[PDB]
Every structure is written in structure tokens, then in C-alpha cells.
Design a protein around this motif. Structure first.
Motif, PDB file in Angstrom:
ATOM      1  N   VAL A  36      -7.516 -10.108   7.572  1.00  7.87           N
ATOM      2  CA  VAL A  36      -6.383  -9.304   8.061  1.00  7.87           C
ATOM      3  C   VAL A  36      -6.751  -7.832   7.975  1.00  7.87           C
ATOM      4  N   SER A  37      -6.683  -7.094   9.086  1.00  6.00           N
ATOM      5  CA  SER A  37      -7.014  -5.667   9.077  1.00  6.00           C
ATOM      6  C   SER A  37      -6.179  -4.774   9.992  1.00  6.00           C
ATOM      7  N   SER A  38      -6.237  -3.463   9.748  1.00  3.03           N
ATOM      8  CA  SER A  38      -5.518  -2.464  10.558  1.00  3.03           C
ATOM      9  C   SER A  38      -6.283  -1.139  10.603  1.00  3.03           C
ATOM     10  N   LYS A  39      -6.704  -0.709  11.780  1.00  4.44           N
ATOM     11  CA  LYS A  39      -7.535   0.491  11.877  1.00  4.44           C
ATOM     12  C   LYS A  39      -6.679   1.757  11.961  1.00  4.44           C
ATOM     13  N   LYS A  40      -7.245   2.879  11.519  1.00  2.71           N
ATOM     14  CA  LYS A  40      -6.582   4.193  11.525  1.00  2.71           C
ATOM     15  C   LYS A  40      -5.181   4.162  10.920  1.00  2.71           C
ATOM     16  N   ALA A  41      -5.069   3.529   9.762  1.00  5.92           N
ATOM     17  CA  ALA A  41      -3.828   3.478   9.018  1.00  5.92           C
ATOM     18  C   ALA A  41      -3.566   4.828   8.396  1.00  5.92           C
ATOM     19  N   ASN A  42      -2.277   5.162   8.271  1.00  4.18           N
ATOM     20  CA  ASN A  42      -1.867   6.254   7.403  1.00  4.18           C
ATOM     21  C   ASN A  42      -1.672   5.689   6.018  1.00  4.18           C
ATOM     22  N   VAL A  43      -2.339   6.289   5.040  1.00  4.75           N
ATOM     23  CA  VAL A  43      -2.309   5.778   3.694  1.00  4.75           C
ATOM     24  C   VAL A  43      -1.877   6.927   2.793  1.00  4.75           C
ATOM     25  N   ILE A  44      -0.684   6.759   2.199  1.00  2.00           N
ATOM     26  CA  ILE A  44      -0.091   7.718   1.306  1.00  2.00           C
ATOM     27  C   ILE A  44      -0.435   7.368  -0.115  1.00  2.00           C
ATOM     28  N   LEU A  45      -0.897   8.383  -0.850  1.00  3.58           N
ATOM     29  CA  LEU A  45      -1.088   8.291  -2.291  1.00  3.58           C
ATOM     30  C   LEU A  45       0.189   8.652  -3.037  1.00  3.58           C
ATOM     31  N   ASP A  46       0.796   7.687  -3.717  1.00  2.00           N
ATOM     32  CA  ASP A  46       1.975   7.949  -4.515  1.00  2.00           C
ATOM     33  C   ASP A  46       1.988   7.119  -5.773  1.00  2.00           C
ATOM     34  N   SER A  47       1.495   7.730  -6.848  1.00  2.00           N
ATOM     35  CA  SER A  47       1.396   7.040  -8.123  1.00  2.00           C
ATOM     36  C   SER A  47       2.710   6.588  -8.707  1.00  2.00           C
ATOM     37  N   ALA A  48       3.818   7.172  -8.254  1.00  2.16           N
ATOM     38  CA  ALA A  48       5.155   6.727  -8.649  1.00  2.16           C
ATOM     39  C   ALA A  48       5.592   5.444  -7.959  1.00  2.16           C
ATOM     40  N   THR A  49       4.979   5.077  -6.848  1.00  9.13           N
ATOM     41  CA  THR A  49       5.276   3.773  -6.249  1.00  9.13           C
ATOM     42  C   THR A  49       4.668   2.678  -7.150  1.00  9.13           C
ATOM     43  N   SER A  50       5.460   1.636  -7.396  1.00  7.52           N
ATOM     44  CA  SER A  50       5.132   0.632  -8.390  1.00  7.52           C
ATOM     45  C   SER A  50       4.075  -0.376  -7.940  1.00  7.52           C
ATOM     46  N   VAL A  51       3.816  -0.468  -6.639  1.00 11.24           N
ATOM     47  CA  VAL A  51       3.001  -1.510  -6.035  1.00 11.24           C
ATOM     48  C   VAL A  51       2.138  -0.959  -4.903  1.00 11.24           C
ATOM     49  N   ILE A  52       1.304  -1.825  -4.339  1.00 11.69           N
ATOM     50  CA  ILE A  52       0.629  -1.567  -3.079  1.00 11.69           C
ATOM     51  C   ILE A  52       1.597  -1.985  -2.000  1.00 11.69           C
ATOM     52  N   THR A  53       1.746  -1.221  -0.929  1.00 11.54           N
ATOM     53  CA  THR A  53       2.559  -1.714   0.181  1.00 11.54           C
ATOM     54  C   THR A  53       1.744  -1.928   1.452  1.00 11.54           C
ATOM     55  N   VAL A  54       2.138  -2.926   2.229  1.00 11.16           N
ATOM     56  CA  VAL A  54       1.588  -3.162   3.551  1.00 11.16           C
ATOM     57  C   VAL A  54       2.713  -3.484   4.550  1.00 11.16           C
ATOM     58  N   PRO A  55       2.467  -3.309   5.860  1.00  9.91           N
ATOM     59  CA  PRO A  55       3.472  -3.769   6.848  1.00  9.91           C
ATOM     60  C   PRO A  55       3.804  -5.247   6.708  1.00  9.91           C
ATOM     61  N   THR A  56       4.982  -5.641   7.167  1.00 10.51           N
ATOM     62  CA  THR A  56       5.437  -7.023   6.962  1.00 10.51           C
ATOM     63  C   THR A  56       4.576  -8.040   7.686  1.00 10.51           C
ATOM     64  N   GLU A  57       4.285  -7.786   8.955  1.00 10.77           N
ATOM     65  CA  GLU A  57       3.435  -8.691   9.738  1.00 10.77           C
ATOM     66  C   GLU A  57       2.071  -8.887   9.069  1.00 10.77           C
ATOM     67  N   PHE A  58       1.465  -7.768   8.722  1.00  8.14           N
ATOM     68  CA  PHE A  58       0.208  -7.738   7.990  1.00  8.14           C
ATOM     69  C   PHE A  58       0.266  -8.615   6.727  1.00  8.14           C
ATOM     70  N   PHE A  59       1.359  -8.499   5.976  1.00  7.68           N
ATOM     71  CA  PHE A  59       1.542  -9.242   4.718  1.00  7.68           C
ATOM     72  C   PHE A  59       1.610 -10.742   4.938  1.00  7.68           C
ATOM     73  N   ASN A  60       2.372 -11.146   5.945  1.00  9.99           N
ATOM     74  CA  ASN A  60       2.557 -12.554   6.271  1.00  9.99           C
ATOM     75  C   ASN A  60       1.236 -13.243   6.583  1.00  9.99           C
ATOM     76  N   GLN A  61       0.406 -12.590   7.390  1.00  6.20           N
ATOM     77  CA  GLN A  61      -0.922 -13.109   7.699  1.00  6.20           C
ATOM     78  C   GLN A  61      -1.744 -13.218   6.411  1.00  6.20           C
ATOM     79  N   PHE A  62      -1.674 -12.182   5.587  1.00  6.47           N
ATOM     80  CA  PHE A  62      -2.343 -12.173   4.290  1.00  6.47           C
ATOM     81  C   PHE A  62      -1.960 -13.376   3.397  1.00  6.47           C
TER      82      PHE A  62
END
Lengths: 380, 380
Positions: A256-282
Motif C-alpha cells: 500500500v503506497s501514496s506518492k507526494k504525501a503531505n506529512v505533518i510532524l506533530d509529537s502531540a498527536t498520539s498515533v500515526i495517521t493515514v487516510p481511511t482508504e489507505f488504512f483499509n487496504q493496509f
């Protein structure tokens, strides 16, 4: 590093997602439900595999940890406050002694009359959002984080509506901005930039060190690179936004992959996040079990199918192995773990690197050059 | 009634849906899962309420009870067999001594050479269905159900494929037809009709009495109305099909209804059945809980929202109260019950009255007049 550093470092406390989940499990007496459901999964009796992920919370703020500390002071009399860190805001915010709301009653207040160093500004300011509304005024005083001090323009809050039940339940008084976004139109530099402007530090940079073996702790270092936190080189990526700790990367979770993603660094976020469609395939045929009625994905700790997560730049790949994105639940079921990866649709093709990522990578946030840096964290 | 009756009565045994469910629960160790899931439902934590009913089994044969007895005999030497009753077939079926299949090896066999009363027929006959295939031949001999005896043409089975794993696991040898449908084109009257033809009984009628307090037992009475089974009058409805125990009725479950329904009487069906759409409307806001991953609908025994089921004819309404369509699960959870009502789409607007209905209504099946009769069963 932490015993007598080179640059100013402060420790902060973290209430994390594990802690909140355990609270919810005790509250609603859910342990045996979870245990019995997993047993069902392991017997092959949940099928074929259904989709109950919605559970559209969705909110990025349902995923926020509270990163807090109580060592920052305002004014020459050093008025004490408990602040949470916010990685997107560039302002400092505190309750005013003049706060009319009930929220403010149990909180520490700033009282401009008790500080000889106060300089009036009075420019009014207002945030309105879905979660709530804050109105107040700008005031100028000394803002001290231990070793570092500078006259600085912060927001004194006169009315706070919403942010409940959290605000009243928390010991937190205000918010200390480690981001770029100023609510004023008076070009108030972030606290960190202003320190450099006034020659309090060499450079407008800070780092976050999250120790691998204490998930209730982090360390913020201001004004330089403290090399005793990390092994090997620092790699740098350029921000792809003028006002966010955000970069360009290609994301691959196994096939499962996605090119030219925007990836925000936020140490206050508790988890890794991905889009829903992406997650389901994962999670599909990855032998991960969604516990019915809970926002909870579980699997065995030794799951031999779980891939390495890859965040690729043109000259570096950052990765997370299963052991860095799974959280043991040994107190529920022997060798059970949860996924610290949540589906959430933000801005299109936008991903967040939260606490799990930063437990592996020491991270650097460089206002002078508009870069973020990454290196392998040491285990201290 | 059962101690020295007026007309010939035989008892039969029933393996029911409760029994099969308890077997499945022991096998897969499901008790605590069910208990913990119910607790979740009661805490208000399953929501809003989702639809996981599909679980399209669907099959009417997944719902069949096994109604069996071992007192019927073939030939003048009285060769013993264990038969299950089938309410739609009008033939009697037994394994032949010449059966080549492995299925037949542990079964009682008919051996035409050992009976002085055998008369050859040899007309070949074959059933093919989804569940399996039976081929054999017609043979004529004495068929005795205790007090009643008549020379009768039954099917001697020479090859049986399918019907597994049930047939091999069951002690049942063959099938005894209490219906209308003959596989031959030689107009073989049902056993019951032939008794009347030969003046063994007054009338071609039988009744089913299912005692309210023994769900593993029923009683079949042949050749007359035994009035000591029931209270009040017998009401009669006309069959709406030449070859089925099926009538015209308007069905109302509370506000959910369906006019001019086809309603089949089949005491071997383990539950009440309704169309799927009809069922969904019924269970919606009725506070019934579908247990995830099991074909199981549960609710508290005292549920004050559950309506009376109504089956209306032009001159009589038959009803079932909640206490007649719920089955206590006290061995799983105090005051928990299951619904003995299953969604299943058959022929359009077709409903089945199975065991729950007949635990309240004594039922009469009248070949001479093409009627079914209903009366309030006594508690014996």
C-alpha cells in the motif's frame, strides 16, 4: 543530555492514548469483553471479515495527547503556570485575572498589576473554533522557561467558552506555542524566534526527544542541537508550507503506497495517521482484528505479516517497524498488542507523524532555515 | 390423552434449536463472549444500532428440528427402524439391505427376503436436491405404527449420497411422510389416507401435540380428534394449496404487518419465520440485541416493548405472546432470553409456523377435508 545539558532543556509530561484507553476500559469494565472477542477472532469465528471502522470519530483532536509542564513563568515576580505545548500555534496564552468564565476559576491567572515588567498592549484578539471560543488581549511581559528569558507579547485570556469537559478537568492553565501561526497581524515572532532576535540563544531551533522507554515523558531543547540524544547523522527535509512543520514524502506500508504525501510532524498527536482508504487496504488480510463497538485494532505482538512503514524522501527513508507501531496490552491478554495507527481523512493525501514516530526519531524544528531534522534517538 | 388414549398415539423425540445452540456454545466456549457482549449492550455502548443480520444462512433446513421415533416396523417379522417425521413428503423411506453407500452401513436395513408379506414392485424412484441424492425402488409390505397396520408401498433406498455430516451422526434410518407430496406418479396415498381407505381408522386425520413443558417431546395421534389435548373449540382453516399444509392469513407483529400471507404449518421447523424486511422493522427500536458474529438475537425476558404476534383469518386470530416466542437462557445470563423468530425469505410473503406456535396450539391436519385445525393446547 539530561544531566547538565549544553542548551536549555525542559522535561514535560504526557497523558497518552494508552492511558486514556485504560481509563475507558476500567470505567466501562471492558477487559473481559475485549479478551473474549479476541478469543473469538483466534478461533476463526469472526468472518469473512467485516468493516466496522466507521466509527468516523474522526477528529484529529480525539487523538491529541496532552504535553504539559509547570516550570514557565510570567513577569518579574515569576507568576507560575501549567502550559500544554501546541506545535501549530506561535502564541503563548494564559488566563487573565479578569476572566469572567467559570472555566478560569480554578486556574492560575496573570495579574498585570503585580508585575513591574508588564507593558500594556491591549490589542484585542479572538479565536473561534468548533471546539470553543477564546477572547482576550495582548500583553507584554517577561516569559521565562528556566534558563531562557525574554520580554514577549502573549495573549491574556478574558473569556473562554467550550473546550469542556477537558479544560476544567485538567490542571493545565494555558498553551505555549511551538509553531508558526500567530493570531495577531502584528508579526509576533514565536517565542523561540524572539529569543534569537534578542541574542538569548545562538539559533531559532528546538528539538523534541521522546524517550523510548518512558511514554509519559518528553524533552524540549531550545537554541541548539544536543548531540547526546541521538546516534548517527541528522538528515534535513525542507518544509513544503510557510507556516507548518510539514514535508513532502512518499508513503509505503508494504504494498500500500501514496506518492507526494503531505506529512505533518506533530509529537502531540498520539498515533500515526493515514487516510481511511489507505488504512483499509493496509489491514486487509494483515490479520488485524477490529474489536466490535470499540475504536480498537488488535493483533498478536509477533504478527509475521505486519510490514515496515516507509516515509521516503529523495535522499533518506524514515521507517517504523511493527514493534514501534504496536502497543503491548499484556494486562488484557498475553501477547496482545494494539495498532497505534488510525485512519483519518484530513486535507487530501495528508498523513501525521505523532508520538510513535518520535519515539524512534529525535526531531529538530528549525525556524531560521524552514527545515525539520531527523536522527535515530538514543535510549536514555 | 397419553395414558390409554381413544385413537392411536405415538410419542416422538425432538432435538431442538436450543440443544444445538448449547452444543455450539460448549464446543466453541462462547458463554462468556455472549455474557460480556450483552453487558455491553446494557451499558448503552453498542450503537447506534448496526445491521449484522447477514448471516444469510439462509436455508430453511438450518432451522429444522429432528422429530424421531423407533416404534415403526416393516413386514410380518416387524423389522425395526428409527424414522424422522417430514411434514411435506407423503412417502415412507428406509435403507435397503442392498444399499451400496457408506452412509447405510451403520443403519437398520429392510431385507425383502426375510418378510413373508413383501410384494415386489421394483418401480425405480429418485430424489435429487441440493442437500443430496437418494435413489431406490418401491416395495410393498406391512407398515405398522403400533396399533395401526396396513399393506403399504414405501421406498426402499439403494444409494444415498449427501445429507452429511447429519445422517451418519444421527441414529435415524429413514423418513416417515406426514405430508401430501408423492415422488411416484402412481398416486400412492399417504400412509394416513391408506389406513382410512382400508378401514383401519375412521377418518384420514392426525394431530400434533407438543407439550408446553417438554421441548424434547411431541405426540402424534392418528385417525381422530383426541379432545383431552386441548381446551375450547377447534377452529378450522382451508388449505390454500393442494399439496401443502398451508393457509391464507394476515400477519401483524405490533405495527409491522403483511396481508394475505402464505403461512405454512411445520412442527419440525424449530422457530417462527418471517421475511427479512419484515423482521428488521420488527426488531428496530424493540431493544433486541444481535450478538456480533452469532446468529442470535437476545433480550431481557421481561422486555415491556415486545408485542403479541397475530395471525388473522376471517373468523379467528391465532396469537403468540412474548413468553411463547422467547427462550430463557438463564444458564448464560440471569433473565436473558433469545428470540425464537428468524428472518428468512422463501416464496414471497411466506411465513412458517414451527415449534413455538405448536407449543401453544394443538394442531389437526385433515386429509379428507383439506383443512388444518387449531385449539388451545392443555398443559399435560
Amino acid at each position: 543530555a539530561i544531566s547538565d545539558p549544553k542548551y536549555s532543556t525542559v522535561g514535560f509530561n504526557i497523558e497518552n492514548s494508552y492511558d486514556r484507553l485504560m481509563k475507558t476500559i476500567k470505567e466501562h469494565k471492558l477487559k473481559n469483553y475485549i479478551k473474549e472477542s479476541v478469543k473469538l477472532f483466534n478461533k476463526g469465528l469472526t468472518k469473512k471479515s467485516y468493516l466496522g471502522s466507521e466509527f468516523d470519530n474522526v477528529e484529529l483532536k480525539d487523538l491529541a495527547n496532552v504535553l504539559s509542564f509547570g516550570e514557565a513563568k510570567l513577569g518579574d515576580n515569576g507568576q507560575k503556570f501549567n502550559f500544554l505545548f501546541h506545535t501549530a500555534s506561535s502564541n503563548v496564552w494564559v488566563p487573565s485575572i479578569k476572566c469572567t468564565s467559570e472555566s478560569c476559576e480554578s486556574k492560575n491567572h496573570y495579574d498585570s498589576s503585580k508585575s513591574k515588567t508588564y507593558e500594556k498592549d491591549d490589542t484585542p484578539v479572538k479565536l473561534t473554533s468548533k471546539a470553543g471560543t477564546i477572547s482576550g488581549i495582548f500583553s507584554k511581559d517577561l516569559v521565562t522557561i528556566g534558563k531562557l528569558s525574554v520580554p514577549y507579547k502573549f495573549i491574556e485570556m478574558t473569556e473562554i467558552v467550550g473546550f469542556e469537559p477537558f479544560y476544567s478537568e485538567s490542571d493545565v492553565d494555558g498553551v505555549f506555542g511551538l509553531g508558526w501561526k500567530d493570531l495577531s497581524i502584528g508579526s509576533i515572532d514565536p517565542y523561540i524566534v524572539e529569543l534569537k532576535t534578542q541574542n538569548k540563544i545562538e539559533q531559532a531551533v528546538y528539538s523534541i526527544y521522546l524517550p523510548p522507554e518512558n511514554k509519559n515523558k518528553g524533552y524540549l531543547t531550545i537554541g541548539g542541537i544536543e548531540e547526546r540524544f541521538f546516534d548517527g547523522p541528522l538528515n534535513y527535509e525542507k518544509l513544503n508550507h510557510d507556516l507548518m512543520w510539514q514535508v513532502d514524502l512518499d508513503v509505503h506500508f508494504g504494498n500500500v503506497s501514496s506518492k507526494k504525501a503531505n506529512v505533518i510532524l506533530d509529537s502531540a498527536t498520539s498515533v500515526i495517521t493515514v487516510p481511511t482508504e489507505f488504512f483499509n487496504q493496509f489491514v486487509e488480510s494483515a490479520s488485524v482484528f477490529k474489536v466490535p463497538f470499540l475504536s480498537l485494532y488488535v493483533t498478536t505482538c509477533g504478527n509475521t505479516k505486519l510490514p515496515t512503514l516507509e516515509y521516503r524522501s529523495p535522499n533518506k527513508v524514515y521507517t517504523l517497524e511493527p514493534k514501534q507501531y504496536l502497543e503491548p496490552l499484556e494486562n488484557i491478554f498475553s501477547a496482545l498488542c494494539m495498532l497505534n495507527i488510525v485512519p483519518i481523512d484530513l486535507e487530501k493525501n495528508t498523513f501525521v507523524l505523532g508520538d510513535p514516530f518520535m519515539r524512534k526519531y529525535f526531531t529538530v524544528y528549525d525556524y531560521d532555515n524552514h527545515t525539520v531534522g531527523f536522527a535515530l534517538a538514543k535510549n536514555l
